[PDB]
Structure to design on (483 residues):
């Protein structure tokens, strides 16, 4: 008499409403001033990797090593956005985007990660910022989106607290240069992924392998980096510039496989290990107690000063979200030994769910609603920005370019997840203030290379031609309708 594979919540307001029904309703509206946007990251789109003074990032180093990137791809050229940024901004104007989320290449501004500003690098981000504002688009900026300067990577990267210090000094430089115009700052993008993929599994730069200790240490120093950047911002810039700052965290929604307390506990535990790992420090001042107790001497301890620096170090909750996982309570005692054994949960997908162009991307729109609601509950009703959400259409690169433009699945993903976001705003009272679709452009999808396509806008990498897909046009109409 144990119910499994049944995710509907009895009595949930709006639970049964389809995306079509949500958008057909005359009463469906979004908050005033809602920031409809799209997101990118510097290494994924800019190119010009070794021109105009840019120093190498650890992803330049990583991508040059045979076997690290699928199909031998690199970010050397990417979408050539460094040269073509004016055209890309005009595309965004045409779509009526309210806002754009981009990242700054740390090593384009500070080639060694510290020291002298590279004038042409700084000038690019000033020019990009001005171009956005001149075209009515609100610029929002990610300071760290994985392109750690190689010089810092060589000195231990996020396993070295020196990197956190350097990050704070870099944030300082960017606030001073752009903060008169940029009023929404994201410190780090997906510290989970940097820690696990970059330092734990080695699938991402810098390619290190240790799941017992490295993820927790890399997470630790990223958090210290966040605290340092926010401290600078609050003390030196915030009163004067009147902007806001926060982190961009990430997780799948974690849904219990069965209606048992064991599976409910396992699902909650995965949310803690993925998201609260970073958010409890930022909102409450320390790691979750259950993580400290489970992980023991493999979890670094914050000093008293660090806890003070971390508590309350966000003005909003940035969240990247794509997918949902089912969680099961293990039936045999799991030993705490490494990140995935520590969280004591068995992870799976419902085979009935559609998937994107990688196995991690399950298409489960209601996960968006449930995660947003979870965030509201745990972190005392913060301002929330959905800072990434999007779809890689399976085998899109093997389609004719013409067929790829008719991206019905991406249309359905956009509509579905936005409708469930709306439910969170309307029924669950989550204070969502913006939504940034991943991505404006097809781009360098890290270790998957260019084969995996997330764009609203198709890029022909041979000619660099941009072409709007169906989803871009649907998104344009959505934004105009709900201003
Ligand atoms: Ca200029």
């Amino acid at each position: 008499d144990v119910t499994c594979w049944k995710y509907a919540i009895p009595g949930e307001p709006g639970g049964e409403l389809t995306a079509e029904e949500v958008f057909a309703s005359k009463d469906t509206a979004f908050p005033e001033g809602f920031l409809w946007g799209a997101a990118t990251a510097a290494y994924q789109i800019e190119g010009a990797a070794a021109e105009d003074g840019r120093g190498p990032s650890m992803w330049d180093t990583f991508s040059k090593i045979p076997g690290k990137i699928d199909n031998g791809d690199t970010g050397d050229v990417a979408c050539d956005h460094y040269h073509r940024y004016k055209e890309d901004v005009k595309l965004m104007k045409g779509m009526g985007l309210k806002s754009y989320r981009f990242s700054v290449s740390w090593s384009r501004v500070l080639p060694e990660g510290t020291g002298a500003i590279n004038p042409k690098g700084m000038e690019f981000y000033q020019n990009l910022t001005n171009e956005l504002i001149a075209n009515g688009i609100v610029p929002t900026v990610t300071l760290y989106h994985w392109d750690l300067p190689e010089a810092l990577s060589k000195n231990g990267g996020w396993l070295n607290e020196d990197t956190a210090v350097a990050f704070g000094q870099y944030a300082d430089v960017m606030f001073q240069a752009l903060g008169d115009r940029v009023k929404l700052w994201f410190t780090l993008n997906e510290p989970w992924t940097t820690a696990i993929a970059g330092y734990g599994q080695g699938g991402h730069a810098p390619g290190l392998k240790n799941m017992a200790e490295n993820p927790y240490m890399a997470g630790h120093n990223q958090l210290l980096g966040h605290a340092a950047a926010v401290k600078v911002y609050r003390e030196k810039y915030q009163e004067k510039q009147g902007g806001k700052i926060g982190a961009v965290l990430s997780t799948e929604w974690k849904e219990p496989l069965c209606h048992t307390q064991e599976d409910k506990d396992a699902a909650e535990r995965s949310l803690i290990w993925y998201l609260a790992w970073f958010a409890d420090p930022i909102y409450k001042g320390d790691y979750p107690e259950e993580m400290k107790e489970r992980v023991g001497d493999r979890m670094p301890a914050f000093t008293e000063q660090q806890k003070q620096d971390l508590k309350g170090s966000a003005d909003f909750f940035g969240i990247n979200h794509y997918a949902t996982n089912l969680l099961q309570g293990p039936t045999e005692k799991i030993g705490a030994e490494n990140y995935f054994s520590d969280l004591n949960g068995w992870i799976m997908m419902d085979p009935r769910w559609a998937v994107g162009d990688a196995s991690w991307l399950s298409v489960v729109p209601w996960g968006m609603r449930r995660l947003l609601r979870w965030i509201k509950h745990r972190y005392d009703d913060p301002v929330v920005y959905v800072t990434e959400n999007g779809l890689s259409v399976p085998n899109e690169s093997a389609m004719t370019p013409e067929a790829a433009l008719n991206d019905k699945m991406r249309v359905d993903y956009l509509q579905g997840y936005v409708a469930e976001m709306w439910k969170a705003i309307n029924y669950d009272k989550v204070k969502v203030a913006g939504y940034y679709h991943w991505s404006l452009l097809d781009n360098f999808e890290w270790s998957d290379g260019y084969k995996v396509r997330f764009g609203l806008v198709q890029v022909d990498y041979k000619t660099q031609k941009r072409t709007l897909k169906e989803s871009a046009k649907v998104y344009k109409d959505m934004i105009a309708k709900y201003s």
Q: What stands out?
A: Residues 126-127, 130 surround calcium ion (CB under 6 Å). The radius of gyration is 21 Å. The longest helix spans residues 214-241.
